[PDB]
Amino acid sequence: GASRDDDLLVPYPRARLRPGSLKHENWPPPPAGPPAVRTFVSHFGGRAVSGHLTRAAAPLRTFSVLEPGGPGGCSQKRRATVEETAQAAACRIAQNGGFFRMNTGECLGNVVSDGRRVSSSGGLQNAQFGIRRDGTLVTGYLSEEEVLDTENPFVQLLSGVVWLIRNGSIYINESQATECDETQETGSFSKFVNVMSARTAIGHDRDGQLVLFHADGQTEQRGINLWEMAEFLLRQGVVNAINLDGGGSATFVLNGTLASYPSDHCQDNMWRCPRRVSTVVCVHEP
Amino acid sequence: GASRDDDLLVPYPRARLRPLKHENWPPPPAAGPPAVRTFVSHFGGRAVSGHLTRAAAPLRTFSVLEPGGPGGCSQKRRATVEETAQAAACRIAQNGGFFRMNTGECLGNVVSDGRRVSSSGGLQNAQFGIRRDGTLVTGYLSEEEVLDTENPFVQLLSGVVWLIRNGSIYINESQATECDETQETGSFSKFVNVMSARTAIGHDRDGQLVLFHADGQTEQRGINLWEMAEFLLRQGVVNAINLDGGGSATFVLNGTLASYPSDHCQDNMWRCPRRVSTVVCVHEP
Numbered sequence: 001g002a003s004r005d006d007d008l009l010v011p012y013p014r015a016r017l018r019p020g021s022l023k024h025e026n027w028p029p030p031p032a033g034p035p036a037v038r039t040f041v042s043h044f045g046g047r048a049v050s051g052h053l054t055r056a057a058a059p060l061r062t063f064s065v066l067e068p069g070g071p072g073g074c075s076q077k078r079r080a081t082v083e084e085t086a087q088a089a090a091c092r093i094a095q096n097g098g099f100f101r102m103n104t105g106e107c108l109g110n111v112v113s114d115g116r117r118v119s120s121s122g123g124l125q126n127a128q129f130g131i132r133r134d135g136t137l138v139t140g141y142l143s144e145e146e147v148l149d150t151e152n153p154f155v156q157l158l159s160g161v162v163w164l165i166r167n168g169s170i171y172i173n174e175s176q177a178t179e180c181d182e183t184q185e186t187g188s189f190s191k192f193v194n195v196m197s198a199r200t201a202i203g204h205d206r207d208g209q210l211v212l213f214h215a216d217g218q219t220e221q222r223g224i225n226l227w228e229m230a231e232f233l234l235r236q237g238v239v240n241a242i243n244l245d246g247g248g249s250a251t252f253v254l255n256g257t258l259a260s261y262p263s264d265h266c267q268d269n270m271w272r273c274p275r276r277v278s279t280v281v282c283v284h285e286p
Numbered sequence: 287g288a289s290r291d292d293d294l295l296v297p298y299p300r301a302r303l304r305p306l307k308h309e310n311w312p313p314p315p316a317a318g319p320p321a322v323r324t325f326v327s328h329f330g331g332r333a334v335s336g337h338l339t340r341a342a343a344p345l346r347t348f349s350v351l352e353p354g355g356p357g358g359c360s361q362k363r364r365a366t367v368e369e370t371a372q373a374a375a376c377r378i379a380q381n382g383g384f385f386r387m388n389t390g391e392c393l394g395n396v397v398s399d400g401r402r403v404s405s406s407g408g409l410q411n412a413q414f415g416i417r418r419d420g421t422l423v424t425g426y427l428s429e430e431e432v433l434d435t436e437n438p439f440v441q442l443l444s445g446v447v448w449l450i451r452n453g454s455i456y457i458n459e460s461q462a463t464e465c466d467e468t469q470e471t472g473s474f475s476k477f478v479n480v481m482s483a484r485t486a487i488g489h490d491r492d493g494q495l496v497l498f499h500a501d502g503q504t505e506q507r508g509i510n511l512w513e514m515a516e517f518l519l520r521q522g523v524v525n526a527i528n529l530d531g532g533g534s535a536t537f538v539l540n541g542t543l544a545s546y547p548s549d550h551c552q553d554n555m556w557r558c559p560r561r562v563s564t565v566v567c568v569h570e571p
């Protein structure tokens with residue numbers, strides 16, 4: 001019927017509730033095509049791992065954040081596979097997006113899909129990547145006051161854990177202090193950053209183009225952590241980037257069909273089944 | 287728009303020039319959609335990624351294609367699995383028999399839509415084909431029956447090594463038939479023992495088609511031929527044969543790439559699919 005949801009990469013085993021200044025970076029839009037998908041099997045720390053790197057021009061026109069099963073997915077606490085959501089949205093390239101609660105399925109953190117707020121952070125502060133109507137690519141942390149600005153408002157936005165790069169500099173350490181909570185253990189979260197597994201990320205490059213990353217693997221066995229990931233991205237010319245859901249949620253859909261190897265297993269156990277995720281990251285051409 | 291052709295797995299570095307029973311499975315008496323299964327399983331203590339496929343009604347769901355459409359081998363053409371599969375609107379497709387990289391010729395007996403497109407030329411290798419009545423053939427055959435008007439072939443291709451016979455491994459028995467005396471004795475045995483990405487084709491007792499794919503790299507990542515054949519046998523394949531592998535190892539699903547090619551691009555950093563000869567296609571009315 002679906003996945004067994006075994007390969008879990010959880011930043012917080014204890015669900016966070018709804019009860020150092022924090023600012024964000026914005027990159028103006030250079031004036032300007034199809035995406036550029038690149039498959040690879042490269043070595044990190046002596047381990048070969050497979051993944052994908054994507055590039056798109058006109059993020060304001062080719063980028064979109066989708067809800068599980070179409071508009072209103074988060075409002076109904078819905079969960080759908082990247083293929084189902086991508087096939088319905090006719091996305092050239094698609095992969096899983098923000099985090100969620102597996103059992104309930106609601107979308108956690110700020111989320112903007114086509115100028116519509118679908119989820120709110122609720123006082124919590126994590127890494128977020130969004131685009132404003134003027135065409136500026138934003139990354140980092142924003143307050144709900146800035147999120148709600150009606151002058152050059154966000155058109156597409158999602159949130160993830162850790163801010164991977166800021167202005168061409170690694171920003172993991174700066175996120176470890178900001179995005180870590182003290183009520184939960186400090187080593188359950190630090191593992192989420194250091195443990196090896198399949199994960200995804202999103203960012204942009206010096207030329208003003210959107211970037212999407214995906215790496216296959218397994219929790220503790222195969223894949224990469226967040227440290228190894230950022231360096232490869234810097235080698236690829238990304239300015240700002242944030243991490244996204246990974247583990248069994250790591251899914252890369254190309255032309256509406258699965259192109260990655262999910263980490264989770266099927267009920268039959270032998271085979272790997274894609275996970276039903278909340279929001280999806282979509283790239284297309286009108 | 288082409289591969290760098292770095293990951294080479296050659297059964298014979300020295301090209302052979304132009305100078306025996308088979309098994310057949312009758313059609314059991316009765317059509318579900320194909321079953322594509324992603325996996326990361328352990329072979330000799332190392333995990334490798336791949337796909338395993340199965341289709342019923344091979345007489346109705348199986349097809350052998352030429353690179354870029356009909357006449358591909360006749361024109362010594364080379365095309366990517368995606369290119370050939372997209373034109374045929376195949377749900378599941380992967381590279382097939384071997385070919386000459388320099389010229390582009392298709393090696394071994396090949397039947398695409400009931401027409402012989404290439405001949406073995408006196409050489410004897412493992413072959414998998416289907417006859418119009420529904421009989422599934424595997425092993426070695428003489429040209430008299432191949433072109434015979436008795437249950438003529440509708441789909442046929444050739445590859446190196448016969449992996450399984452009647453639910454039993456036939457590699458040892460195949461090495462004796464498929465061993466050459468002109469080539470060195472260690473290049474071919476390595477071809478069987480070396481670990482890398484390869485593909486295979488076979489069938490089950492119920493009369494269903496099977497297709498296999500395993501990602502990897504020559505000698506670095508993947509599996510050899512010994513580990514590969516058994517995984518299918520544990521899954522209920524009766525007969526199976528090996529197919530082209532290495533940089534040609536490609537799995538295309540619904541017309542799009544779903545595997546990780548071993549070859550590199552001219553840019554070097556990225557991996558590019560290789561342009562192959564014949565392709566195996568699976569679709570539904």
Ligand SMILES: *[C@@H]1O[C@H](CO[C@@H]2O[C@@H](C)[C@@H](O)[C@@H](O)[C@@H]2O)[C@@H](O[C@@H]2O[C@H](CO)[C@@H](O)[C@H](O)[C@H]2NC(C)=O)[C@H](O)[C@H]1NC(C)=O
Binds near residue numbers: 083087256257539
């Ligand atoms: C490859 O593509 C097919 C999509 O094809 C269509 O889907 C349906 C409309 C059905 O009528 C098929 O015959 C069509 O050709 C995927 O198969 C299906 O997806 C749809 C979901 O919208 C579903 O209704 C079908 O039942 C699906 N078929 C199966 C076997 O599940 C197929 O999964 C695609 N493969 C991948 C990896 O995306």
Ligand SMILES: *[C@@H]1O[C@H](CO)[C@@H](O)[C@H](O)[C@H]1NC(C)=O
Binds near residue numbers: 255542
């Ligand atoms: C798949 O990607 C290729 C890349 O060029 C594109 O040409 C093709 O249109 C895509 N598939 C569909 C159904 O659009």
Ligand SMILES: [Br-]
Binds near residue numbers: 012014016017
């Ligand atoms: Br939470």
Ligand SMILES: [Br-]
Binds near residue numbers: 298300301302
């Ligand atoms: Br040869």
Ligand SMILES: [Cl-]
Binds near residue numbers: 026027
């Ligand atoms: Cl600035």
Ligand SMILES: [Cl-]
Binds near residue numbers: 036038
């Ligand atoms: Cl590139």
Ligand SMILES: [Cl-]
Binds near residue numbers: 045046047
């Ligand atoms: Cl290691």
Ligand SMILES: [Cl-]
């Ligand atoms: Cl609610």
Ligand SMILES: [Cl-]
Binds near residue numbers: 161
């Ligand atoms: Cl979040």
Ligand SMILES: [Cl-]
Binds near residue numbers: 218
């Ligand atoms: Cl495992």
Ligand SMILES: [Cl-]
Binds near residue numbers: 089090284285286
């Ligand atoms: Cl569209």
Ligand SMILES: [Cl-]
Binds near residue numbers: 287288366369
């Ligand atoms: Cl091409």
Ligand SMILES: [Cl-]
Binds near residue numbers: 292293294295504
């Ligand atoms: Cl090589």
Ligand SMILES: [Cl-]
Binds near residue numbers: 327328517
């Ligand atoms: Cl196994």
Ligand SMILES: [Cl-]
């Ligand atoms: Cl296990």
Ligand SMILES: [Cl-]
Binds near residue numbers: 329330
């Ligand atoms: Cl071994």
